[PDB]
């Protein structure tokens, strides 16, 4: 399994490392998939690069 997670910029390294660990564990547990088979990619979005309803995250 390969997971990619788009999140807004601004979080600490430590919190991102938690995200990676906890998502990986959830995938492994859910699927009975070996933990070493699980890859996670965190993709940070600049606040001026994410829209909801046509309005920026930076607003
Ligand atoms: C997760 C993607 F299907 C499995 C994988 O990449 C692997 O078996 O190494």
DSSP-assigned states of every residue in the chain:
-EEEEEEES---HHHHHHHHHHHHHHHHHHHT--GGG-EEEEEEEPGGG-EETTEETT-
Kindly report each contact of residues 23-32 with a partner whose C-beta sits within 8 Å and lies 24 or more positions away, as own/partner.
27/1, 27/3, 31/1
Q: Report whether residue 4 contacts ligand 1, using a CB cutoff of 6 Å.
A: no
Q: Record the resolution, in angstroms.
A: 1.5
Distance, in Å, from the CA atom of 47 to the CA atom of 8, rounded to the nearest integer, reads 6
Distance, in Å, from the CA atom of 6 to the CA atom of 49, rounded to the nearest integer, reads 11
Closest by alpha carbon to 5, among 25, 16, 14?
Answer: 16
Elucidation technique: X-ray
| Domains along the sequence of the chain with CATH | 1-59 (3.30.429.10)
Probe target for ligand 1 pocket from 31, 37, 38, 41, with the most ligand atoms within 8 Å of CB: 37
Q: Report whether residue 1 contacts ligand 1, using a CB cutoff of 6 Å.
A: yes
Size (the chain), residues: 59
Catalytic, 34? Answer no
Distance from the CA of 32 to the center of ligand 1, in angstroms? 12
Distance, in Å, from the CA atom of 19 to the CA atom of 13, rounded to the nearest integer, reads 10
Distance from the CA of 42 to the center of ligand 1, in angstroms? 17
């Amino acid at each position: 399994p390969i997971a990619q997670i788009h999140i807004l910029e601004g979080r600490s390294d430590e919190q991102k490392e938690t995200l990676i660990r906890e998502v990986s564990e959830a995938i492994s547990r859910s699927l009975d998939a070996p933990l070493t088979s699980v890859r996670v990619i965190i993709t940070e979005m600049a606040k001026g690069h994410f829209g909801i309803g046509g309005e920026l995250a930076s607003k």
